[PDB]
Amino acid sequence: GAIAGFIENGWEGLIDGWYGFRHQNAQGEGTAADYKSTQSAIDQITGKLNRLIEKTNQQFELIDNEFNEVEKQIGNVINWTRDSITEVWSYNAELLVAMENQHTIDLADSEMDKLYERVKRQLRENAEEDGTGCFEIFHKCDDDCMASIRNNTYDHSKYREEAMQNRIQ
Amino acid sequence: GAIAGFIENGWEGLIDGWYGFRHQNAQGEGTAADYKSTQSAIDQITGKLNRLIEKTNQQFELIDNEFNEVEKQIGNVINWTRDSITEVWSYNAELLVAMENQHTIDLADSEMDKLYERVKRQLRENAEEDGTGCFEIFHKCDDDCMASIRNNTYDHSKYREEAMQNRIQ
Amino acid sequence: GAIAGFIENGWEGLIDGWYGFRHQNAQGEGTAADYKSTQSAIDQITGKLNRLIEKTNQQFELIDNEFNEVEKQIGNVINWTRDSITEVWSYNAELLVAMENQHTIDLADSEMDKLYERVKRQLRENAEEDGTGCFEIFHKCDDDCMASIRNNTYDHSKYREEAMQNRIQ
Amino acid sequence: DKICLGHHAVSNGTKVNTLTERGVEVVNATETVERTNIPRICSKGKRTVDLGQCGLLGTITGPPQCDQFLEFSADLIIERREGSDVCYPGKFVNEEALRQILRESGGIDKEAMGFTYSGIRTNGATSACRRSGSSFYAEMKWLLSNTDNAAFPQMTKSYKNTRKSPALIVWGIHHSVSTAEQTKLYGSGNKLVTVGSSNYQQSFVPSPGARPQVNGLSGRIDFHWLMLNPNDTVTFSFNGAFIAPDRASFLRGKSMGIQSGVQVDANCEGDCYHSGGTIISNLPFQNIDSRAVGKCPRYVKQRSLLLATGMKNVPEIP
Amino acid sequence: DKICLGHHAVSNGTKVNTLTERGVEVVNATETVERTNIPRICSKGKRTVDLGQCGLLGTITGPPQCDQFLEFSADLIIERREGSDVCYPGKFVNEEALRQILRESGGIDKEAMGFTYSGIRTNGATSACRRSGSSFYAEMKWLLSNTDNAAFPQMTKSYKNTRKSPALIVWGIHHSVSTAEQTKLYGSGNKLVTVGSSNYQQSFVPSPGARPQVNGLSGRIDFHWLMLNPNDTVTFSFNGAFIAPDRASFLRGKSMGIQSGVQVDANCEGDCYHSGGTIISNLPFQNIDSRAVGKCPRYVKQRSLLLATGMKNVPEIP
Amino acid sequence: DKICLGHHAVSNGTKVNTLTERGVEVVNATETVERTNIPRICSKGKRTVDLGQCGLLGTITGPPQCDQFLEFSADLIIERREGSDVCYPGKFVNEEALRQILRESGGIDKEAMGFTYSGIRTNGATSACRRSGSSFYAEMKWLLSNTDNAAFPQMTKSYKNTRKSPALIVWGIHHSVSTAEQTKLYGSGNKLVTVGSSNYQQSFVPSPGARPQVNGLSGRIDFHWLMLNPNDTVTFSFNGAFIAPDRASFLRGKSMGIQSGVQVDANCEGDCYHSGGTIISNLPFQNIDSRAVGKCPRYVKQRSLLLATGMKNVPEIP
């Protein structure tokens, strides 16, 4: 009945956010979402969306005719030009999406690290990494203490004596 | 009257470099720039610049006439082709700059981390992270000691006893 | 006769993998490759390769003649269009390769960090970073112990007492 | 006591592509390539003409089919396949260039050219241009000799464009089924029509000869056109086989022309059209029609290109 | 005791380019731009005709050089520089459009048009079209008066396309060295040839006059062509100087035409060609020929673009 | 004791765009799209001709305006709007193709064609081509009958290109105001001009008729041109209404032609031009003129695209 964070698995139960906290203390197990990192990621993704929505003001008119076919020579020149251009946009679209998606995925991982790194820096010398995305806290952390971490009001100085004692022996 | 590093703020007083050190000891407060990380970042940015300066040897000549308009059919085919091509380069330019800028910004952050990580590895077990981009040094570090860190000549073995003593209790 | 990991140097002796381990204990020095990180990197690179191999089904036919030159006006329009398109693909190719290579290099560094970070998290409080990509292990690690690390079966709890003792004094 | 950092995931994962992987699952994605078509012409906010049987070029010469459109006005112009520019069998020279011109004309304003004739019939008519009875193009005058086989006098008519915009001038050459018929209409001898401007100079000769019967007729009237610059003049010297214009055309302003085979809708509002309907989309790309016109997303070969709108989906360890 | 993490490296490093650096060494790289050419036409799996001396347009009219190809069939068509569409000096009108049509025709199927003549010679022949002795185009009939200076009667021949595909119709106008020669062949007076269809109407006049001697001859036969729609008819009214067709052409299906000056190979299998050979490559780009045709990688200016297939190469500290 | 790591920042931040953000402040940025124009033609290092009133095609036929340029030489050729190819009213056939040819000719070298005439006037002149008194095109000969209404004998002149480069051959057809005037000049009867080469064959007829007065004249001389292959010959058979050439043209080498309405400067050095001046820039893009020519940066719609040349700007906490 253990818990684990990122690094081989996500949380299908986290349904009110993208990134979040999951803890276990004497009061039991709990899971809450982090707002700041979630919104930051959402802001960046929608940012891409709006960018790809930016319409063009370039108007194009008919250059040939599908009722009465134009002359062969100029007609083949036109088809050759359009097909060439189509090849170009198809390539651009394929590359754009592939490139964007690679970045969307990476910046998502990036946000996860930043959150993990922030929590690590809050806990100072009062905790150790378990290697599953979790921290082993070497003191009593009731639900109020866990909440103090989630809102960045955890004062490690308060727990430092009790923690280092339990860590050393 | 505290000091803080990267993570929510830059230094407007750092005017002789891109990345730098800021310390406070008994001798007071001081700020110096790091050369290596600054130059590395400058080398990468100018590297992009030279790449975008690479001119073309493709020469183009007049295909129509702005004094005496060419025939309508071939004239409209030309305008249709040029406008289509213009749409392509406008897209490329927009994407190129957006993509470059995203990378320029990220590699700049990257250099900051590397510098922070290097200093962390110099200090070994003699310091702790405060979470504002700074290190709390658990021994006396005069201006000479601070300089030893900046030029990567800090021998943690020299201060290790005094440091671990102050960290533990 | 010391050893050093990544951070200013690669290993020309590592010839059976991309990433690997190098240790020294009483039994001497040894070097082994890590499979998982090596294959992951290879999977990503070949992934790019297959993507760039994806052929087109667009067929193009002759639009002019190199035995009997076509009319000047339509002939110059054609050359102008082809040259313009050639400029576009030359640009795309240059950018594609430059962009891919930047990413190939970065994801390679990324894999190195992940491996280093994983090992760091295995060792817990029983080791310290030397700053050359290596870990100073503060206990006896025979060849069997070194192997336990490489296959992620190192139980830090087993060595924790002996390690913290040697680290503290 | 223990606190873990994590990210959400689903069982409802959708695959996308990247630089390296093909089919990597992300939490959420959206489509970038439109395939959703509206099989109607969304004409709201736009003055629209459904020419139907009236060919676009027919709006200038004026066969019966185009009588309603002789001075039309539009923001959107719709050609139909059943359209025809012709009653008496024939075709325009440089037809497509002319269509491209009229598609963005915003419509046409007609003006009398004021030609007068003497010792000649102008009541040239045909069964093919039936308007009640036998008739002819509404903007043209089919000129004959006077009786039959009679000599057609040489003539020289001119017209100046006293307006600030160029004038669409259209005339026709008639090609009789036989020299016997050409003689019956315009008299004997070789026939020449010359057309002079100040940036244009051409010449025209009838080509009498047997041809297949179109609408029961083996004769052809081929039309020719030029644009007359402001204050410039055209001059028509001829001696028979000439289809004279009665009025000139002036372009009203700006419009857009399409060809389609679907109905119009005045409730929907669109700006990108193809023959099969209207494309309304904020998506950057489309896979409906390469020849789509107006303000459209770029056409691509692919039917689908999913853009990741969520992180990589990593299943929870059960 | 100490454990280090590391990555491999070489002394055999190869430089590539990135966004920032130019010439950064990586462990391993591969080429993305093909420069390797196969100086042969890889024709395996494809029915191939090496027209050689037979010009592609010659396959329709049929000079001696093209006698083997009068009803050819192919998937790949190869034009050669020594090719010629002509025996008696002349050229097609709209030649390139016609070539582009025949290059993807899959070959041609010929069919008699069934013309019959009276009070006229049809045995028009020349020294330039030598087939054993003096002869003429195989699919055409050079029509003369009857004796010499004799009057050439007006005629009117027609042909309907009773097939489901359009028919390639080709006729010729003869331009004599002098009016003296034109008279000797077709009699005195002005000569007119008219050609009528149901979407086509043209007219033709001979232009007798002195010209440089090609193949010893100062006369020219210029060819003209149209495509006859299914169930539509063409009509030829004329009175001399007319080169009548004997057969019509029908396109067999689908093919691809190239121009080349290198040999064919039936063992190699390719799909991208240029005049200098075949490009077989999985590479996305090529720097061989901008005008390469078939299914080809994109042409680029650069001869080389190395793609990194390995990490950055960092030398070991010795 | 405490040591902090940091990065610089400013209050003078400049906004740029990325994949995700729009208007993210960076420390420093530079422009990639040129908008800075030099309203002059930077001609340093380049031999330059400002044709002025001489139309480019006029350099071949030689009206008075082009007398200085009859054998010009240049690296850069500048057309001006006030330029004219004509003294006696008329126009070239295939004019734009010819312009495109001459724009990169590097200039022209003229050579006598050596025609001689008998029983004919060659002193055809007009008030429109005033050079001191009434005159004509410098490289042409206006041929007449001999007295008035007199018969114009049939003639046949030929010229071979004995040089290693193709020869620009130009001739003219004259269109009289009336058949009365055509008769007065070249005698009665239909007039034909034939032009024969070894890859060219055409025919020409005058079209006498009333036209608007240009320069007081209702007559038109329309010019025609071909390129004569080395060692090939042209032949001119005619009987009136023919404007004969006196000299042929040979292309000097390589140049570039532009149209402009701004002055020239011999101090500035440029390589990218448009009608409004010269673009000198190392920037990859420009937003000045889509039709700019030479070696230019790519044209874009946007006026500005800032490239970040510094890190993200993060203000210091006060």
Ligand SMILES: *[C@@H]1O[C@H](CO)[C@@H](O[C@@H]2O[C@H](CO)[C@@H](O[C@@H]3O[C@H](CO)[C@@H](O)[C@H](O)[C@@H]3O)[C@H](O)[C@H]2NC(C)=O)[C@H](O)[C@H]1NC(C)=O
């Ligand atoms: C999965 O990704 C899609 C694509 O981003 C998400 O759907 C999007 O949801 C937002 C908000 O619900 C929609 O925004 C809307 O904008 C329109 C236009 O301003 C407005 O009228 C609406 O009221 C709404 O604010 C957006 O259009 C919509 N995108 C699509 C393509 O439908 C979806 O939310 C993602 N899934 C999850 C679980 O978040």
Ligand SMILES: *[C@@H]1O[C@H](CO)[C@@H](O[C@@H]2O[C@H](CO)[C@@H](O[C@@H]3O[C@H](CO)[C@@H](O)[C@H](O)[C@@H]3O)[C@H](O)[C@H]2NC(C)=O)[C@H](O)[C@H]1NC(C)=O
């Ligand atoms: C340096 O990079 C090149 C390029 O990736 C590597 O060469 C590649 O090696 C692989 C495996 O040896 C080749 O895969 C092959 O695929 C074909 C087609 O399916 C198959 O017939 C072969 O049996 C093989 O499986 C690949 O083609 C080849 N690429 C090239 C361009 O030759 C090379 O391995 C890299 N160097 C090192 C030391 O790994």
Ligand SMILES: *[C@@H]1O[C@H](CO)[C@@H](O[C@@H]2O[C@H](CO)[C@@H](O[C@@H]3O[C@H](CO)[C@@H](O)[C@H](O)[C@@H]3O)[C@H](O)[C@H]2NC(C)=O)[C@H](O)[C@H]1NC(C)=O
């Ligand atoms: C803000 O970014 C701009 C753009 O990079 C920086 O301006 C650049 O400054 C460098 C050095 O001062 C200029 O290099 C120059 O190259 C030319 C040509 O070789 C040479 O003649 C000069 O003597 C100089 O070495 C560069 O041209 C210039 N770029 C522009 C567009 O002016 C600027 O330095 C950045 N701001 C700060 C505070 O660094």
Ligand SMILES: *[C@@H]1O[C@H](CO)[C@@H](O)[C@H](O)[C@H]1NC(C)=O
């Ligand atoms: C242009 O492409 C269309 C699309 O298939 C084709 O139907 C048409 O025949 C092409 N034009 C010519 C002149 O072949």
Ligand SMILES: *[C@@H]1O[C@H](CO)[C@@H](O)[C@H](O)[C@H]1NC(C)=O
């Ligand atoms: C080509 O585009 C220019 C730019 O507006 C326009 O003035 C010109 O009329 C166009 N050409 C034709 C034939 O309409």
Ligand SMILES: *[C@@H]1O[C@H](CO)[C@@H](O)[C@H](O)[C@H]1NC(C)=O
């Ligand atoms: C098209 O480009 C080729 C390549 O140099 C050139 O040889 C040819 O002359 C060009 N076409 C025309 C009409 O100039």
Ligand SMILES: *[C@@H]1O[C@H](CO)[C@@H](O)[C@H](O)[C@H]1NC(C)=O
């Ligand atoms: C108008 O035409 C007359 C001759 O018809 C001409 O003299 C004049 O220059 C033209 N322009 C104006 C503005 O009058």
Ligand SMILES: *[C@@H]1O[C@H](CO)[C@@H](O)[C@H](O)[C@H]1NC(C)=O
């Ligand atoms: C075939 O041609 C005849 C006249 O020759 C015409 O009446 C008919 O409509 C055409 N089509 C069919 C399917 O018979």
Ligand SMILES: *[C@@H]1O[C@H](CO)[C@@H](O)[C@H](O)[C@H]1NC(C)=O
């Ligand atoms: C030059 O022209 C003559 C006839 O005028 C011809 O016989 C010869 O083949 C041509 N070429 C050379 C190189 O003499």
